[PDB]
Amino acid sequence: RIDRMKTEFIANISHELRTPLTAIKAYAETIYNSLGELDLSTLKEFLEVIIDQSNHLENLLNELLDFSRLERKSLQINREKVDLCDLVESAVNAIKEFASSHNVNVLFESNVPCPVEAYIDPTRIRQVLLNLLNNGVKYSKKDAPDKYVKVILDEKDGGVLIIVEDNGIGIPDHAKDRIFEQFYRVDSSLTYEVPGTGLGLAITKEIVELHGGRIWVESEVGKGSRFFVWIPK
Amino acid sequence: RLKRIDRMKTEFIANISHELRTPLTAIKAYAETIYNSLGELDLSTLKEFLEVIIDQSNHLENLLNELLDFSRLERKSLQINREKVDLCDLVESAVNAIKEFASSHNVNVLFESNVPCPVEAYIDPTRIRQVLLNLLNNGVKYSKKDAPDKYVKVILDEKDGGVLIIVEDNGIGIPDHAKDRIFEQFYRVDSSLTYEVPGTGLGLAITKEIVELHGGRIWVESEVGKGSRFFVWIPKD
Amino acid sequence: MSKKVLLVDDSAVLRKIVSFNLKKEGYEVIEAENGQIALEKLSEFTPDLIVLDIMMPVMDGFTVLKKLQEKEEWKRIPVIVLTAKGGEEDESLALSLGARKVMRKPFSPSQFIEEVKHLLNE
Amino acid sequence: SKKVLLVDDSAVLRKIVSFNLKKEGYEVIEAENGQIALEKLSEFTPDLIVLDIMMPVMDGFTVLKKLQEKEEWKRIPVIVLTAKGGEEDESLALSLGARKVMRKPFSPSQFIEEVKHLLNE
Numbered sequence: 027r028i029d030r031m032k033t034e035f036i037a038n039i040s041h042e043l044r045t046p047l048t049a050i051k052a053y054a055e056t057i058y059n060s061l062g063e064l065d066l067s068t069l070k071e072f073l074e075v076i077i078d079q080s081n082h083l084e085n086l087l088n089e090l091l092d093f094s095r096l097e098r099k100s101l102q103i104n105r106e107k108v109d110l111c112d113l114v115e116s117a118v119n120a121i122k123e124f125a126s127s128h129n130v131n132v133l134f135e136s137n138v139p140c141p142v143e144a145y146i147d148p149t150r151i152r153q154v155l156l157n158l159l160n161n162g163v164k165y166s167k168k169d170a171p172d173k174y175v176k177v178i179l180d181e182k183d184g185g186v187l188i189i190v191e192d193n194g195i196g197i198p199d200h201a202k203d204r205i206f207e208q209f210y211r212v213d214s215s216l217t218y219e220v221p222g223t224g225l226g227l228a229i230t231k232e233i234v235e236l237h238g239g240r241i242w243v244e245s246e247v248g249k250g251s252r253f254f255v256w257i258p259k
Numbered sequence: 260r261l262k263r264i265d266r267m268k269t270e271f272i273a274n275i276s277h278e279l280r281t282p283l284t285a286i287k288a289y290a291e292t293i294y295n296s297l298g299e300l301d302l303s304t305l306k307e308f309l310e311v312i313i314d315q316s317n318h319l320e321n322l323l324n325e326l327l328d329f330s331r332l333e334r335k336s337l338q339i340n341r342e343k344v345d346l347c348d349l350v351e352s353a354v355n356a357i358k359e360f361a362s363s364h365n366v367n368v369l370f371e372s373n374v375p376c377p378v379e380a381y382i383d384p385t386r387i388r389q390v391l392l393n394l395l396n397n398g399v400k401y402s403k404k405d406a407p408d409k410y411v412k413v414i415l416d417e418k419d420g421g422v423l424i425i426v427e428d429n430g431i432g433i434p435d436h437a438k439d440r441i442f443e444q445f446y447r448v449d450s451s452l453t454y455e456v457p458g459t460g461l462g463l464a465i466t467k468e469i470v471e472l473h474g475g476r477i478w479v480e481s482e483v484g485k486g487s488r489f490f491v492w493i494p495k496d
Numbered sequence: 497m498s499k500k501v502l503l504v505d506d507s508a509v510l511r512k513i514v515s516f517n518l519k520k521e522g523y524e525v526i527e528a529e530n531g532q533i534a535l536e537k538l539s540e541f542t543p544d545l546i547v548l549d550i551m552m553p554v555m556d557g558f559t560v561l562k563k564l565q566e567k568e569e570w571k572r573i574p575v576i577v578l579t580a581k582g583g584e585e586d587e588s589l590a591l592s593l594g595a596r597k598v599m600r601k602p603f604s605p606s607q608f609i610e611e612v613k614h615l616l617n618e
Numbered sequence: 619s620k621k622v623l624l625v626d627d628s629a630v631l632r633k634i635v636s637f638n639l640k641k642e643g644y645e646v647i648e649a650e651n652g653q654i655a656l657e658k659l660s661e662f663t664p665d666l667i668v669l670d671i672m673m674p675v676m677d678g679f680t681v682l683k684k685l686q687e688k689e690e691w692k693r694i695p696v697i698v699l700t701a702k703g704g705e706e707d708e709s710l711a712l713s714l715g716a717r718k719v720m721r722k723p724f725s726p727s728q729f730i731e732e733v734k735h736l737l738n739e
């Protein structure tokens with residue numbers, strides 16, 4: 027079960043941490059050996075690369091740590107009155123650079139009028155949003171002119187309903203029941219070069235369920251996917 | 260029946276995070292300081308700080324190579340390639356490589372050969388160097404907290420139609436109940452004298468599998484509070 | 497009238513970069529490789545701020561914080577905990593032990609310095 | 619004067635390798651994937667190709683394969699620069715026609731030494 031997919035997971039951590047490290051090592055050694063051949067704006071640009079690549083590396087270590095905290099039941103959420111319209115706007119801001127990197131537009135529409143109120147942990151639900159947004163970009167179409175990720179906000183069943191919609195590669199029907207489990211990743215020609223651990227949605231699920239909420243998915247292969255997050259108030 | 264391996268898996272995931280966080284902290288802090296202090300940095304300090312970024316990236320790289328080699332060994336894709344080579348030079352090269360780390364924790368690195376050099380052997384020099392470095396790193400990592408005469412010694416000898424390498428330390432030692440588990444993947448001794456010491460519990464499992472791919476064996480003798488001897492036996496031809 | 501800062505961490509690499517950023521503001525810096533050495537250094541002088549790691553050999557930072565609250569001349573010295581321990585419960589423990597602020601590693605040097613200033617300036 | 623086709627799907631990687639290449643006075647043409655790399659070979663014939671393996675649309679193994687199938691392309695020396703660390707990955711790349719395989723993370727200075735060795739002689 028877990029012991030099967032553990033070896034692949036170990037190789038996957040290796041591959042995803044390797045990419046920013048390559049940039050860090052290459053940019054740092056270049057600066058070190060090219061001090062006479064760098065103008066000031068290129069030196070500062072190259073330092074920013076080291077910094078931004080460190081930050082991605084830091085995000086990946088926080089994924090590993092949050093997962094071990096969730097498995098150990100060490101993560102105690104702390105709820106408070108929060109505006110989800112601002113939370114969602116703040117989340118799409120943070121993802122914009124990575125989105126334009128893969129030519130994916132990021133959208134936000136609320137069916138109910140803003141601002142919407144909810145009793146949630148802002149840090150942990152921000153973490154839920156970003157994982158779904160990151161996924162929308164990571165698994166978007168290869169060569170397409172109209173790629174997108176849309177966060178749609180609504181109030182239903184005495185609670186908030188956040189939908190994250192993409193028009194990406196989609197998810198096979200057999201995989202739909204397993205995407206939320208730890209270490210699981212769809213293995214195909216369309217996800218061979220896409221880095222990841224298979225921990226994101228497991229972390230998202232456990233966080234959502236700590237809030238007494240649920241997460242589910244609908245997907246068609248070649249069309250796109252919708253992730254539904256329901257949390258009460 | 261035994262979900263201990265799943266608990267050890269969760270420990271392992273947290274341990275990867277801890278070991279990789281330390282060089283990352285240095286990388287981030289040193290890069291951001293350079294970026295914001297170009298007007299206040301002199302040239303020797305700018306270069307010094309860049310060297311820290313480079314050296315900390317390299318430790319990070321070695322830790323990522325540990326995870327990859329383990330997955331390669333677990334899948335059984337790592338197929339060794341043997342050639343004639345001198346183990347006296349190979350051991351010297353390995354202690355040279357570990358010298359900076361050793362002086363960081365005030366540990367003297369020694370090398371003895373009970374037979375005259377050079378000692379020829381049919382081995383994969385890359386993989387046996389990897390075995391040597393893991394045992395040397397462990398000698399430094401698990402040395403005493405505060406003592407004046409810290410050491411890791413590699414003793415070389417020819418035995419049983421083969422080469423016998425001993426890695427001796429005078430560090431914290433290993434309990435008896437842990438002696439038959441230190442080679443297992445993800446296993447680490449949990450105590451007051453290993454709380455701050457980073458690692459994944461992969462090193463000795465990688466070493467064991469590399470050694471057994473050569474048709475060799477590895478074993479340990481240890482006394483708590485005294486030190487440890489790791490024995491590696493490889494056939495010569 | 498230079499503000500004195502006791503810098504407590506077992507990483508030389510960490511001490512050097514924090515000490516550089518501290519000295520950029522004009523603060524004097526006294527280093528300690530562990531918590532026991534840190535407490536021994538308090539006989540020589542009394543700092544305006546202690547920067548404290550948690551995980552160290554010999555003596556850890558929770559034990560240091562505990563021993564700071566016992567003495568009346570220490571108990572008033574502000575402490576920023578700067579640590580790789582990212583747990584909410586680790587933060588809570590540090591704050592209950594008498595730490596004023598807890599910052600996770602990896603850290604922004606400029607945010608660290610901003611918080612150092614806040615504590616030194618009332 | 620010397621023309622280098624740089625093939626990798628990371629803009630961050632292309633930028634640092636291009637900078638180190640242009641330090642030696644080489645011209646650099648970039649391609650985001652293997653398919654684009656082959657389309658660029660109609661415009662010009664480079665003196666050296668630097669090739670990533672893992673790319674969307676078309677990976678570097680099939681680029682190397684298609685380079686052997688053309689007469690003008692087959693003689694262009696190729697350095698594979700790749701995150702793929704397996705010995706069997708290297709062996710596959712060498713038997714597919716690559717002159718040199720280098721792993722990421724990489725030393726820019728070592729990479730430039732190897733670029734020079736293939737260009738000169």
Ligand SMILES: Nc1ncnc2c1ncn2[C@@H]1O[C@H](COP(=O)(O)OP(=O)(O)O)[C@@H](O)[C@H]1O
Pocket residue numbers: 157161162164165166192194195196197205206210211212213217221222223224225226227228251
């Ligand atoms: N928006 C999406 N579109 C298509 N597939 C997805 C999407 N989000 C997640 N997946 C699939 O679910 C798997 C698990 O996702 P996640 O848990 O975030 O891990 P990772 O992104 O590291 O693979 C992915 O490997 C991918 O196959």
Ligand SMILES: Nc1ncnc2c1ncn2[C@@H]1O[C@H](COP(=O)(O)OP(=O)(O)O)[C@@H](O)[C@H]1O
Pocket residue numbers: 393397398400401402428430431432433441442446447448449453457458459460461462463464487
């Ligand atoms: N020379 C040594 N002295 C004392 N203990 C050791 C020594 N070498 C290994 N150990 C113990 O064996 C465990 C496994 O070692 P290793 O497989 O290298 O993993 P790691 O060093 O990452 O913990 C260590 O956690 C440590 O408890």
Ligand SMILES: [Cl-]
Pocket residue numbers: 120
């Ligand atoms: Cl964030």
Ligand SMILES: [Mg+2]
Pocket residue numbers: 455505506507549550551552
């Ligand atoms: Mg520490």
Ligand SMILES: [Mg+2]
Pocket residue numbers: 219626627628670671672673
């Ligand atoms: Mg690639």
